[PDB]
Amino acid sequence: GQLTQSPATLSLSPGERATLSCRASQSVTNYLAWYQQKPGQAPRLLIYGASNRATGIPARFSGSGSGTDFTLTISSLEPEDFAVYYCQQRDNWPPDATFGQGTKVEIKRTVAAPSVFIFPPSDEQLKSGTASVVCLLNNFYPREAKVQWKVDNALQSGNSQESVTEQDSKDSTYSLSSTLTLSKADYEKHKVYACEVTHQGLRSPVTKSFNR
Amino acid sequence: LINLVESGGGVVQPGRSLRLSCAASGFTFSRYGMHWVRQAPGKGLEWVAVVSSDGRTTYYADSVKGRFTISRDNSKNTLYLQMNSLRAEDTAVFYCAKEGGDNKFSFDYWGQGTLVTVSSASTKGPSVFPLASESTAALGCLVKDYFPEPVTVSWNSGALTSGVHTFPAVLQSSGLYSLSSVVTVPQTYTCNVDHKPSNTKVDKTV
Numbered sequence: 001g002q003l004t005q006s007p008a009t010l011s012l013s014p015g016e017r018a019t020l021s022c023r024a025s026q027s028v029t030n031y032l033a034w035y036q037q038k039p040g041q042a043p044r045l046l047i048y049g050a051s052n053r054a055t056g057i058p059a060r061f062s063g064s065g066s067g068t069d070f071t072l073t074i075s076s077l078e079p080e081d082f083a084v085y086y087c088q089q090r091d092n093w094p095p096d097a098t099f100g101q102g103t104k105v106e107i108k109r110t111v112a113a114p115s116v117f118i119f120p121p122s123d124e125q126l127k128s129g130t131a132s133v134v135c136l137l138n139n140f141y142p143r144e145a146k147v148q149w150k151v152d153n154a155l156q157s158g159n160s161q162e163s164v165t166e167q168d169s170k171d172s173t174y175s176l177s178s179t180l181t182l183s184k185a186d187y188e189k190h191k192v193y194a195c196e197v198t199h200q201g202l203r204s205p206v207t208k209s210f211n212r
Numbered sequence: 213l214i215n216l217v218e219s220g221g222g223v224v225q226p227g228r229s230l231r232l233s234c235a236a237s238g239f240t241f242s243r244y245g246m247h248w249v250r251q252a253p254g255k256g257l258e259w260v261a262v263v264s265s266d267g268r269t270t271y272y273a274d275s276v277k278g279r280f281t282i283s284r285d286n287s288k289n290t291l292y293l294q295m296n297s298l299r300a301e302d303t304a305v306f307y308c309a310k311e312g313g314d315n316k317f318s319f320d321y322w323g324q325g326t327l328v329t330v331s332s333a334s335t336k337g338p339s340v341f342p343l344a345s346e347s348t349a350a351l352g353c354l355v356k357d358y359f360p361e362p363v364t365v366s367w368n369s370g371a372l373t374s375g376v377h378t379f380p381a382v383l384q385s386s387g388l389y390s391l392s393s394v395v396t397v398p399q400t401y402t403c404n405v406d407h408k409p410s411n412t413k414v415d416k417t418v
Contacts, residue, residue, distance in 0.1 A: 033318035048318035097259040117350040163379040
Protein backbone atom coordinates (compact mmCIF):
# COMPACT_ATOMS: atom_id res chain seq x y z
CA GLY A 1 0.00 0.00 0.00
CA GLN A 2 2.90 2.33 0.67
CA LEU A 3 6.61 2.20 0.18
CA THR A 4 9.03 4.71 1.72
CA GLN A 5 12.48 5.17 0.22
CA SER A 6 15.42 6.80 1.97
CA PRO A 7 17.46 8.77 1.76
CA ALA A 8 15.84 11.10 -0.77
CA THR A 9 19.26 11.71 -2.32
CA LEU A 10 22.51 9.81 -1.94
CA SER A 11 25.66 11.82 -2.67
CA LEU A 12 28.58 9.49 -3.32
CA SER A 13 31.74 9.35 -5.43
CA PRO A 14 32.51 6.77 -8.13
CA GLY A 15 33.94 3.60 -6.63
CA GLU A 16 31.97 4.02 -3.41
CA ARG A 17 29.30 1.69 -2.08
CA ALA A 18 25.68 2.75 -2.34
CA THR A 19 23.05 1.46 0.04
CA LEU A 20 19.44 2.36 -0.75
CA SER A 21 16.55 1.60 1.56
CA CYS A 22 12.87 0.89 0.99
CA ARG A 23 10.41 0.39 3.85
CA ALA A 24 6.89 -0.99 3.38
CA SER A 25 4.16 0.30 5.72
CA GLN A 26 3.13 -3.30 6.38
CA SER A 27 4.71 -6.64 5.68
CA VAL A 28 4.81 -7.39 1.96
CA THR A 29 3.63 -10.80 0.77
CA ASN A 30 5.96 -10.78 -2.22
CA TYR A 31 9.56 -9.62 -1.99
CA LEU A 32 10.12 -6.28 -3.76
CA ALA A 33 11.63 -5.35 -7.10
CA TRP A 34 14.00 -2.47 -7.89
CA TYR A 35 14.26 -0.25 -10.96
CA GLN A 36 16.83 2.18 -12.30
CA GLN A 37 15.64 5.17 -14.29
CA LYS A 38 17.54 7.81 -16.15
CA PRO A 39 16.11 11.15 -17.35
CA GLY A 40 13.74 10.69 -20.28
CA GLN A 41 14.04 6.91 -20.35
CA ALA A 42 11.91 3.95 -19.37
CA PRO A 43 12.56 2.28 -16.00
CA ARG A 44 14.62 -0.84 -16.16
CA LEU A 45 14.36 -3.87 -13.87
CA LEU A 46 17.42 -4.46 -11.70
CA ILE A 47 16.24 -6.77 -8.95
CA TYR A 48 13.14 -8.90 -8.39
CA GLY A 49 12.04 -11.07 -5.49
CA ALA A 50 14.26 -8.88 -3.30
CA SER A 51 17.56 -10.53 -4.24
CA ASN A 52 17.49 -11.79 -7.84
CA ARG A 53 19.20 -9.85 -10.61
CA ALA A 54 17.30 -9.30 -13.85
CA THR A 55 18.96 -10.37 -17.10
CA GLY A 56 21.89 -8.23 -18.16
CA ILE A 57 22.27 -6.68 -14.72
CA PRO A 58 25.93 -6.55 -13.57
CA ALA A 59 27.08 -8.23 -10.36
CA ARG A 60 27.75 -4.95 -8.54
CA PHE A 61 23.98 -4.70 -8.07
CA SER A 62 22.56 -6.74 -5.21
CA GLY A 63 19.44 -6.77 -3.08
CA SER A 64 18.24 -8.11 0.25
CA GLY A 65 15.35 -7.87 2.67
CA SER A 66 12.03 -9.37 3.68
CA GLY A 67 8.97 -8.31 5.65
CA THR A 68 8.98 -4.50 5.60
CA ASP A 69 12.68 -3.84 5.04
CA PHE A 70 14.50 -4.03 1.75
CA THR A 71 17.87 -2.81 0.58
CA LEU A 72 19.47 -2.25 -2.82
CA THR A 73 23.25 -2.27 -2.80
CA ILE A 74 25.72 -1.16 -5.47
CA SER A 75 29.09 -2.45 -4.26
CA SER A 76 31.13 0.03 -6.30
CA LEU A 77 29.60 2.94 -8.20
CA GLU A 78 30.38 3.39 -11.88
CA PRO A 79 29.63 6.74 -13.60
CA GLU A 80 26.64 5.23 -15.39
CA ASP A 81 25.06 4.21 -12.06
CA PHE A 82 24.17 7.74 -11.06
CA ALA A 83 20.45 7.81 -11.62
CA VAL A 84 17.13 7.48 -9.82
CA TYR A 85 16.08 4.19 -8.21
CA TYR A 86 12.58 2.97 -7.34
CA CYS A 87 11.39 0.01 -5.31
CA GLN A 88 8.16 -1.64 -6.30
CA GLN A 89 5.64 -4.06 -4.94
CA ARG A 90 2.57 -5.95 -6.07
CA ASP A 91 0.21 -8.64 -4.92
CA ASN A 92 -1.99 -11.21 -6.55
CA TRP A 93 -5.11 -9.37 -5.41
CA PRO A 94 -5.87 -6.58 -5.54
CA PRO A 95 -3.43 -6.45 -8.50
CA ASP A 96 -2.30 -2.80 -8.30
CA ALA A 97 1.42 -2.14 -8.05
CA THR A 98 2.85 0.33 -5.54
CA PHE A 99 6.01 2.37 -6.09
CA GLY A 100 8.44 3.99 -3.69
CA GLN A 101 8.99 7.67 -4.41
CA GLY A 102 12.55 7.05 -5.59
CA THR A 103 16.09 7.71 -4.41
CA LYS A 104 18.47 9.75 -6.56
CA VAL A 105 22.07 8.60 -6.50
CA GLU A 106 24.13 11.69 -7.15
CA ILE A 107 27.83 12.32 -7.79
CA LYS A 108 29.64 13.81 -4.87
CA ARG A 109 32.40 16.33 -5.48
CA THR A 110 34.14 19.23 -3.76
CA VAL A 111 32.10 22.31 -2.93
CA ALA A 112 31.90 24.87 -5.73
CA ALA A 113 30.36 28.30 -5.36
CA PRO A 114 28.13 29.45 -8.21
CA SER A 115 28.97 32.55 -10.20
CA VAL A 116 25.87 34.74 -10.26
CA PHE A 117 24.35 36.87 -13.00
CA ILE A 118 21.17 38.90 -13.23
CA PHE A 119 19.48 39.84 -16.50
CA PRO A 120 16.95 42.66 -16.81
CA PRO A 121 13.99 42.16 -19.15
CA SER A 122 14.89 43.08 -22.73
CA ASP A 123 13.36 46.18 -24.29
CA GLU A 124 12.20 43.82 -27.00
CA GLN A 125 10.17 41.91 -24.43
CA LEU A 126 8.99 45.02 -22.63
CA LYS A 127 7.65 46.01 -26.00
CA SER A 128 5.07 43.25 -25.54
CA GLY A 129 3.58 43.84 -22.09
CA THR A 130 5.59 41.48 -19.92
CA ALA A 131 8.87 41.58 -18.07
CA SER A 132 11.00 38.61 -17.14
CA VAL A 133 13.97 39.14 -14.85
CA VAL A 134 16.44 36.28 -14.89
CA CYS A 135 18.95 35.18 -12.28
CA LEU A 136 21.60 32.63 -13.19
CA LEU A 137 23.53 30.37 -10.80
CA ASN A 138 26.38 28.89 -12.83
CA ASN A 139 28.24 25.64 -12.06
CA PHE A 140 27.81 25.00 -8.34
CA TYR A 141 27.92 22.10 -5.87
CA PRO A 142 26.27 20.91 -3.82
CA ARG A 143 22.77 21.13 -5.25
CA GLU A 144 21.23 22.99 -2.29
CA ALA A 145 20.95 26.69 -3.11
CA LYS A 146 18.77 29.58 -2.00
CA VAL A 147 17.49 32.22 -4.39
CA GLN A 148 15.71 35.28 -3.03
CA TRP A 149 14.07 37.94 -5.20
CA LYS A 150 13.64 41.51 -4.03
CA VAL A 151 12.03 44.51 -5.69
CA ASP A 152 12.75 47.82 -3.98
CA ASN A 153 13.45 45.63 -0.98
CA ALA A 154 10.14 43.80 -1.00
CA LEU A 155 10.71 40.06 -0.82
CA GLN A 156 9.06 38.45 -3.86
CA SER A 157 7.09 35.26 -3.24
CA GLY A 158 5.02 33.21 -5.66
CA ASN A 159 5.96 35.03 -8.86
CA SER A 160 9.11 33.14 -9.77
CA GLN A 161 9.92 29.75 -11.23
CA GLU A 162 13.25 28.02 -11.43
CA SER A 163 14.90 25.30 -13.44
CA VAL A 164 18.03 23.24 -12.76
CA THR A 165 20.24 21.40 -15.22
CA GLU A 166 21.27 17.79 -14.77
CA GLN A 167 24.60 17.22 -13.02
CA ASP A 168 27.24 18.22 -15.60
CA SER A 169 28.92 15.32 -17.42
CA LYS A 170 32.46 16.61 -16.93
CA ASP A 171 32.56 18.73 -13.75
CA SER A 172 29.57 17.25 -11.90
CA THR A 173 28.14 20.68 -11.08
CA TYR A 174 24.61 22.03 -11.26
CA SER A 175 23.38 25.25 -12.82
CA LEU A 176 20.14 27.02 -12.04
CA SER A 177 17.85 29.59 -13.58
CA SER A 178 15.33 31.68 -11.66
CA THR A 179 12.82 33.78 -13.55
CA LEU A 180 10.79 36.51 -11.89
CA THR A 181 7.62 37.45 -13.76
CA LEU A 182 6.06 40.89 -13.38
CA SER A 183 3.55 42.74 -15.51
CA LYS A 184 5.22 45.50 -17.48
CA ALA A 185 3.24 48.10 -15.52
CA ASP A 186 4.58 46.83 -12.21
CA TYR A 187 8.11 46.49 -13.56
CA GLU A 188 8.13 50.21 -14.36
CA LYS A 189 6.90 51.16 -10.91
CA HIS A 190 10.03 49.97 -9.18
CA LYS A 191 13.74 50.71 -9.31
CA VAL A 192 15.93 48.15 -7.55
CA TYR A 193 15.85 44.55 -8.75
CA ALA A 194 17.98 42.12 -6.76
CA CYS A 195 18.74 38.41 -6.70
CA GLU A 196 20.35 37.15 -3.50
CA VAL A 197 22.03 33.76 -3.54
CA THR A 198 22.90 31.63 -0.52
CA HIS A 199 25.09 28.57 -1.05
CA GLN A 200 27.56 26.56 1.03
CA GLY A 201 30.39 27.63 -1.26
CA LEU A 202 29.57 31.30 -0.67
CA ARG A 203 30.94 32.48 2.67
CA SER A 204 28.54 35.42 2.40
CA PRO A 205 25.33 35.46 0.37
CA VAL A 206 25.88 37.09 -3.02
CA THR A 207 23.56 39.78 -4.33
CA LYS A 208 23.46 40.76 -7.99
CA SER A 209 21.21 43.70 -8.73
CA PHE A 210 20.39 46.50 -11.13
CA ASN A 211 18.41 49.73 -11.15
CA ARG A 212 15.79 49.89 -13.89
CA LEU B 213 14.63 -10.12 -27.65
CA ILE B 214 11.48 -9.00 -25.88
CA ASN B 215 10.30 -5.58 -26.96
CA LEU B 216 7.45 -3.19 -26.18
CA VAL B 217 6.79 -0.20 -28.43
CA GLU B 218 4.16 2.42 -27.67
CA SER B 219 2.34 4.99 -29.78
CA GLY B 220 -0.79 7.12 -29.68
CA GLY B 221 0.42 9.76 -27.26
CA GLY B 222 -0.23 13.38 -28.11
CA VAL B 223 -1.61 16.76 -27.13
CA VAL B 224 -5.33 17.05 -26.45
CA GLN B 225 -7.87 19.32 -24.92
CA PRO B 226 -9.61 18.60 -21.61
CA GLY B 227 -12.64 16.37 -21.94
CA ARG B 228 -11.37 14.72 -25.11
CA SER B 229 -10.02 11.24 -25.92
CA LEU B 230 -6.84 9.41 -26.87
CA ARG B 231 -6.06 5.78 -27.51
CA LEU B 232 -2.66 4.45 -26.67
CA SER B 233 -1.04 1.31 -28.09
CA CYS B 234 1.79 -0.97 -26.97
CA ALA B 235 2.92 -3.57 -29.49
CA ALA B 236 4.75 -6.56 -28.04
CA SER B 237 7.20 -8.97 -29.66
CA GLY B 238 9.76 -11.58 -28.66
CA PHE B 239 7.53 -13.47 -26.23
CA THR B 240 4.18 -15.23 -26.05
CA PHE B 241 2.12 -12.12 -25.28
CA SER B 242 -1.06 -14.04 -24.42
CA ARG B 243 0.59 -15.66 -21.40
CA TYR B 244 1.36 -12.41 -19.60
CA GLY B 245 -0.59 -9.91 -17.57
CA MET B 246 0.04 -6.43 -18.98
CA HIS B 247 0.01 -3.04 -17.25
CA TRP B 248 0.04 0.70 -17.82
CA VAL B 249 2.13 2.89 -15.53
CA ARG B 250 2.48 6.65 -15.77
CA GLN B 251 4.91 9.31 -14.67
CA ALA B 252 3.78 12.92 -14.46
CA PRO B 253 6.37 15.65 -15.14
CA GLY B 254 8.85 15.66 -12.26
CA LYS B 255 7.04 12.91 -10.35
CA GLY B 256 7.63 9.24 -9.59
CA LEU B 257 6.13 6.13 -11.14
CA GLU B 258 2.40 5.60 -10.70
CA TRP B 259 0.45 2.43 -11.49
CA VAL B 260 -2.57 2.92 -13.77
CA ALA B 261 -4.19 -0.36 -14.80
CA VAL B 262 -3.81 -4.03 -15.62
CA VAL B 263 -5.43 -6.57 -17.91
CA SER B 264 -5.08 -10.30 -17.33
CA SER B 265 -3.29 -12.47 -19.88
CA ASP B 266 -6.62 -13.82 -21.13
CA GLY B 267 -8.08 -10.31 -21.11
CA ARG B 268 -11.04 -11.32 -18.94
CA THR B 269 -9.84 -9.45 -15.85
CA THR B 270 -9.12 -5.72 -15.57
CA TYR B 271 -8.39 -3.37 -12.69
CA TYR B 272 -7.80 0.38 -12.47
CA ALA B 273 -6.35 3.08 -10.26
CA ASP B 274 -9.29 4.89 -8.63
CA SER B 275 -8.26 8.12 -10.33
CA VAL B 276 -8.94 6.69 -13.81
CA LYS B 277 -11.85 4.34 -13.10
CA GLY B 278 -14.82 5.06 -15.36
CA ARG B 279 -12.74 7.12 -17.77
CA PHE B 280 -10.03 4.74 -18.96
CA THR B 281 -10.46 1.27 -20.42
CA ILE B 282 -7.61 -1.20 -20.77
CA SER B 283 -7.80 -4.00 -23.33
CA ARG B 284 -5.61 -6.29 -25.41
CA ASP B 285 -5.45 -8.14 -28.71
CA ASN B 286 -3.75 -11.52 -28.33
CA SER B 287 -3.58 -12.00 -32.09
CA LYS B 288 -1.80 -8.77 -32.94
CA ASN B 289 -0.13 -8.96 -29.52
CA THR B 290 -1.03 -5.41 -28.61
CA LEU B 291 -2.03 -3.70 -25.37
CA TYR B 292 -4.41 -0.73 -25.44
CA LEU B 293 -5.55 2.09 -23.22
CA GLN B 294 -8.61 4.04 -24.31
CA MET B 295 -8.58 7.32 -22.40
CA ASN B 296 -11.82 9.28 -22.19
CA SER B 297 -12.72 12.54 -20.43
CA LEU B 298 -9.06 13.52 -20.08
CA ARG B 299 -8.08 16.16 -17.53
CA ALA B 300 -5.03 18.37 -17.18
CA GLU B 301 -3.76 16.24 -14.30
CA ASP B 302 -3.65 13.11 -16.49
CA THR B 303 -0.69 14.71 -18.25
CA ALA B 304 2.23 12.30 -18.02
CA VAL B 305 4.44 9.84 -19.86
CA PHE B 306 2.54 6.56 -20.11
CA TYR B 307 4.43 3.26 -20.02
CA CYS B 308 3.20 -0.24 -20.72
CA ALA B 309 4.83 -2.91 -18.62
CA LYS B 310 5.05 -6.69 -18.78
CA GLU B 311 4.68 -8.93 -15.74
CA GLY B 312 8.00 -10.68 -15.19
CA GLY B 313 8.69 -14.21 -16.34
CA ASP B 314 10.81 -15.22 -13.35
CA ASN B 315 8.64 -13.12 -11.02
CA LYS B 316 5.19 -11.79 -11.96
CA PHE B 317 5.12 -9.20 -9.18
CA SER B 318 7.90 -7.37 -11.00
CA PHE B 319 7.98 -5.72 -14.43
CA ASP B 320 10.77 -7.21 -16.54
CA TYR B 321 10.07 -5.18 -19.69
CA TRP B 322 8.79 -1.67 -20.26
CA GLY B 323 7.69 0.21 -23.35
CA GLN B 324 9.64 3.38 -24.16
CA GLY B 325 6.79 5.59 -22.98
CA THR B 326 4.41 7.89 -24.83
CA LEU B 327 3.55 11.43 -23.73
CA VAL B 328 -0.01 12.39 -22.99
CA THR B 329 -0.42 16.15 -22.76
CA VAL B 330 -3.85 17.40 -21.76
CA SER B 331 -4.03 21.16 -22.22
CA SER B 332 -6.18 23.86 -23.78
CA ALA B 333 -3.02 25.72 -24.78
CA SER B 334 -2.59 26.62 -28.44
CA THR B 335 0.28 25.48 -30.64
CA LYS B 336 2.56 28.50 -30.56
CA GLY B 337 6.13 29.24 -31.61
CA PRO B 338 8.45 30.97 -29.10
CA SER B 339 9.41 34.62 -28.86
CA VAL B 340 13.17 34.78 -28.42
CA PHE B 341 14.57 37.55 -26.25
CA PRO B 342 18.20 38.46 -25.59
CA LEU B 343 19.78 38.06 -22.17
CA ALA B 344 22.65 40.54 -22.22
CA SER B 345 34.58 44.85 -14.90
CA GLU B 346 34.21 41.09 -14.47
CA SER B 347 36.43 38.01 -14.97
CA THR B 348 33.53 36.14 -16.57
CA ALA B 349 30.48 37.26 -18.51
CA ALA B 350 27.14 35.60 -19.13
CA LEU B 351 24.58 36.00 -21.88
CA GLY B 352 21.89 33.94 -23.53
CA CYS B 353 18.38 33.70 -24.91
CA LEU B 354 14.94 33.64 -23.27
CA VAL B 355 12.83 31.25 -25.29
CA LYS B 356 9.39 32.39 -24.11
CA ASP B 357 5.78 31.32 -24.53
CA TYR B 358 5.73 28.29 -26.79
CA PHE B 359 3.67 25.10 -26.81
CA PRO B 360 4.02 22.29 -26.88
CA GLU B 361 7.41 20.81 -26.02
CA PRO B 362 10.02 20.58 -27.31
CA VAL B 363 12.36 23.26 -28.64
CA THR B 364 15.98 22.74 -29.54
CA VAL B 365 18.59 25.38 -28.85
CA SER B 366 22.12 25.50 -30.22
CA TRP B 367 24.67 28.30 -30.26
CA ASN B 368 26.42 29.53 -33.39
CA SER B 369 24.93 26.67 -35.38
CA GLY B 370 26.52 24.13 -33.05
CA ALA B 371 30.08 25.42 -33.21
CA LEU B 372 29.75 26.74 -29.69
CA THR B 373 29.14 24.26 -26.88
CA SER B 374 31.62 24.96 -24.10
CA GLY B 375 30.10 26.78 -21.14
CA VAL B 376 26.57 26.44 -22.52
CA HIS B 377 23.60 25.55 -20.32
CA THR B 378 20.15 25.11 -21.81
CA PHE B 379 17.68 24.84 -18.95
CA PRO B 380 14.69 22.47 -18.71
CA ALA B 381 11.49 24.20 -19.82
CA VAL B 382 8.95 25.23 -17.18
CA LEU B 383 5.17 25.35 -17.58
CA GLN B 384 4.04 28.91 -16.86
CA SER B 385 0.61 29.51 -15.37
CA SER B 386 -0.50 30.64 -18.83
CA GLY B 387 -0.09 27.05 -19.92
CA LEU B 388 2.84 27.95 -22.17
CA TYR B 389 6.47 26.90 -21.72
CA SER B 390 9.51 29.10 -21.30
CA LEU B 391 13.18 28.32 -20.98
CA SER B 392 16.54 30.01 -20.97
CA SER B 393 19.77 29.04 -22.66
CA VAL B 394 22.93 30.71 -21.45
CA VAL B 395 26.66 30.72 -22.08
CA THR B 396 29.44 32.11 -19.93
CA VAL B 397 32.59 33.54 -21.40
CA PRO B 398 36.01 34.51 -19.98
CA GLN B 399 33.14 36.80 -31.24
CA THR B 400 29.44 36.96 -32.14
CA TYR B 401 26.76 35.01 -30.24
CA THR B 402 23.71 33.58 -31.96
CA CYS B 403 21.20 31.16 -30.42
CA ASN B 404 19.46 28.87 -32.91
CA VAL B 405 15.95 28.06 -31.76
CA ASP B 406 13.79 25.41 -33.45
CA HIS B 407 10.20 24.55 -32.56
CA LYS B 408 8.77 21.88 -34.90
CA PRO B 409 5.17 21.95 -33.70
CA SER B 410 4.82 25.47 -35.12
CA ASN B 411 7.55 25.10 -37.75
CA THR B 412 9.14 28.11 -36.15
CA LYS B 413 12.77 28.93 -36.70
CA VAL B 414 14.79 31.72 -35.19
CA ASP B 415 18.44 32.70 -35.12
CA LYS B 416 18.84 35.36 -32.46
CA THR B 417 22.14 37.21 -32.33
CA VAL B 418 22.69 38.49 -28.79
